[PDB]
Amino acid sequence: LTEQQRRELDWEKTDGLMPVIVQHAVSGEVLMLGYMNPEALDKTIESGKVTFFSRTKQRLWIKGETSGNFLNVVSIAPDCDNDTLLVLANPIGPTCHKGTSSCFGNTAHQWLFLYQLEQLLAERKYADPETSYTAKLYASGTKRIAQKVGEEGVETALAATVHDRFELTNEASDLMYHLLVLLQDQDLDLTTVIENLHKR
C-alpha cells in the first residue's frame, strides 16, 4: 500500500471499519473476512501479521493472538472504489476455529482441487506402502516414478495425435498425478514450477 493509496481509503463510507478479505497467497482459497480500522491496518503493515479491529472486545487483535494461527502478510490491495481491502497471506496453521483451512467450509473454486491433490500426495510421502498407491510409488524409488512420468507423457502425446479427446483427458490426468508425485519425491512442488513459468 502506497501512502496515497492509504490516503484514498474511504473510511467515511465504511464508518471507520474497513472490510478485509484474506486470501491464501498461493492457492487462492478465501480464508476469512474481517474488519480493520486505521490503526489495525497500520499494525498489519508494520508487523507483517494480519491485525483486525474487534468491535466485540473493542480492541486490536492480531489474528492468532489466542490460537497460534497467524496470517503472514504477502500483499494488500484496495478495490476500485477504495472501501474493501484484499490481503494475500500465508497461514501459519489453520485459519478457522473448526480445525479447517477456511472459514467458508467446503466451497472451493475448481482449481483449488489441484492444490489439494498435491497436498494429499505430499502428506503420503514417508507414510508406508499400503496406505495408498502414492506411498507405494514413493517406496519404488525415484527411477520408477520417473518411469511413469515418461510413460504417461508418451500416452498423452499419442492420444492427442490420434485426436481421442477422452483418452487425452485421462492420460493428461495420469501425467499430472505422477508429475506431482515426482516433484514431491525430489523436494519440489508445482508452486515452484508455476513460479519458474512466471519468471518466463
Give residues in contact with Zn ion (CB under 5 A).
Answer: 79-81, 83-84, 96, 103, 152, 155, 171, 174
Residues from 105 through 134 that contact Mg ion (CB under 5 A): none
DSSP one-letter code for 161: H
Min dist CB 134 to Mg ion, Å, is 25
Cα gap 84→9, rounded to integer Å: 8
Amino acid at 104: F
**Which SS3 state, helix, strand or coil, does residue 148 take?**
helix
Contact call for residue 171 and Mg ion (CB under 5 A): yes
The reply on whether position 157 binds its own copies by CB under 8 A is yes
Q: Are 89 and 104 in contact (CB under 8 A)?
A: no
SS3 of 36-68: the string is ECHHHHHHHHHHCECEEEECCCCEEEECCCCCC
Residues between 130 and 159 that touch Mg ion (CB under 5 A): 152, 155
Q: Is 7 in the site for its own copies (CB under 8 A)?
A: no
Per-residue binding letters, 12-51, with its own copies (x by CB under 8 A): -x-----x-x-xxxxxxxx-xx------------------
Provide the b/e sequence for 137-170 (b: ≥16 CB within 10 Å).
Answer: bbeeeeeebeebbeebbebbeebeeeeeeeebee
Return the number of the residue (42 or 174) whose C-beta is nearest Zn ion.
174
Q: Answer yes or no: are the C-beta atoms of 56 and 35 closer than 8 Å.
A: no
Binding mask 105-144 for its own copies (x = CB under 8 A): xxxxxxxxxxx-x------------------------xx-
Q: Which residues, in sequence order, are bridge partners of residue 76?
A: 87
- Told to check if 96 binds its own copies by CB under 8 A, we report yes
Is 174 a residue that touches Mg ion (CB under 5 A)?
Answer: yes
Per the structure block, which three cell numbers stand in for 120? 494429499
Closest CB 51 distance from its own copies, rounded Å: 18
Strand partners for 69: none
Binding to its own copies (CB under 8 A) within 46-65 occurs at 55
- The binder of 57, among Mg ion, its own copies, Zn ion, none, by C-beta within 5 to 8 A per type, is none
Please tell me whether residue 176 binds its own copies under the rule CB under 8 A.
yes
